Amino acid sequence: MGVQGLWKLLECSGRQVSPEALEGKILAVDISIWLNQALKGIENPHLLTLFHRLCKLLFFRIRPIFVFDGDAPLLKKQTLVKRRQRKDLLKAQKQQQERIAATVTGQMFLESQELLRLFGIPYIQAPMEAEAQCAILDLTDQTSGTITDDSAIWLFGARHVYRNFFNKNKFVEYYQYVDFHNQLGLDRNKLINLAYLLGSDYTEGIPTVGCVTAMEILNEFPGHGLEPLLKFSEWWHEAQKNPDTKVKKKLRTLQLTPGFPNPAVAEAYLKPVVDDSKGSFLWGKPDLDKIREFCQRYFGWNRTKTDESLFPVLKQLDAQ
C-alpha cells in the first residue's frame, strides 16, 4: 500500500524484536490494510484472520487502538479516478461499482467493530487517512507507536512502526524514523519527494522511474523541502524548450505531467486532516460468552472450539 517499495530503502534501519518486547505498549493498529486485502476474497475468512490477529495482540498484553479510514481526501479520489480509467483504456455505471464496494466495506467495518467491542478493544473513525491519525496518536505520545505494514505512515510523520507483526515469517521488525534519518540519511521531506517520483495514493509518479532512478534525481538536485523537485522541474522544462553533453541525460527522456511538482501533494502529507485532541481510550475485559456466540454465528464454532483459542489469551492477560 502507499508507495511502490519505500520499505526496500529502510530495510537496514529495522531492528528485529520479539512480540514479548511490545508487552504493555499502547499501539495504534491500522485495520484499513486488512479491509482492502479481504475485499477481493470457507465462509468469513476475513473475520477469522481478524479473530486470530486480535488473540495475538491481547496474548502479548498490547493495548491496541484500531483506526478505520474516514473520508478519502481530494488528491486520493482524483488519482484513483485517473488510474482506474488508464487501466481500462455509462457515467452512472461506475457509481454502482462504488455503491456495491461501499456496502461490502460497510459490512466489514461493522463486523470487525463488533469483534473489537467484544474483545474490549477501542477503535476510532479517523477524519481522513487512518495512517495519518495513527501517526498523530504517535506524535502526541497517546501511543508508543503504530502496528502497520503501510510505508505511507512515514510520510504522515510516524516515529515508531512495528511491521510484519502478523506473518508466517514471525520476525517483528521495529523501525524508528530517528534511526533511518541518521543511518540512511532519509528525512520526512526526502520520503515525500520520493512519493512525487515513485507514485503514491495522492499522485501518479513518472512511468519508468524506479527506486534507483528516483534517488538519482534527488541526489542530482540537492535542496531543502520541495526545492529539489522544483529545480529538477525547472531544469527539465529548460532542457526541453531549447534544442553540450551531461551525466544525467537519462532525465531529458522522461515526460512529466504539466503542473509537476504540484505542491498540493506535499501539503496533503505534511498538513493532513487529523484529530490532535487528547482522547480517553478504555480497554474492556473480553466478553467470553459474547465471543462464543460471534464465533458460532460467523465460523460455526461449538463453545469448546472458541474456548481452545480464547482461554490461553485470557489466562495470559491475568498476569502483569
Numbering used by the authors: 1 to 41, 50 to 97, 750 to 903, 911 to 987
Recite the paper's sentences.
Nucleotide excision repair (NER) is an essential pathway to remove bulky lesions affecting one strand of DNA. The XP complementation group G (XPG) endonuclease cleaves the damaged DNA strand on the 3′ side of the lesion coordinated with DNA re-synthesis. Here, we report four crystal structures of the human XPG nuclease domain (XPGn) in the absence and presence of DNA. The overall fold exhibits similarities to other flap endonucleases but XPG harbors a dynamic helical arch that is uniquely oriented and defines a gateway.
For crystallization, we introduced the D812A mutation to abolish the XPG nuclease activity. Two versions of the protein were purified that differ in the presence or absence of extra residues at the N-terminus. Both constructs retain the ability to bind splayed-arm DNA and were used to determine two crystal structures of XPGn in the free state, hereafter F1 and F2, with four and two molecules in the asymmetric unit, respectively. Helices α4 and α6 are fully ordered in two F1 molecules, while the N-terminal half of α6 is disordered in the other two F1 molecules. Comparison of F1 molecules where the arch is fully ordered shows that α6 can adopt two distinct conformations by pivoting on its C-terminal end. In the open state, the α4 and α6 backbones lie ∼14 Å apart and define a gap of ∼11 Å, while in the closed state α6 approaches α4 by about 3 Å. This enables weak interactions at the outer rim of the arch, leading to the formation of a pore above the active site with a diameter of ∼9 Å. Arch closure in the DNA-free state correlates with a striking conformational change in the hydrophobic core of the protein. In the open state, residue W34 in α2 sits in a hydrophobic pocket that is sealed by a cation–π interaction with R61 in α3. In contrast, in the closed state, W34 flips into a looser hydrophobic environment and inserts between α3 and α6, which both shift in opposite directions.
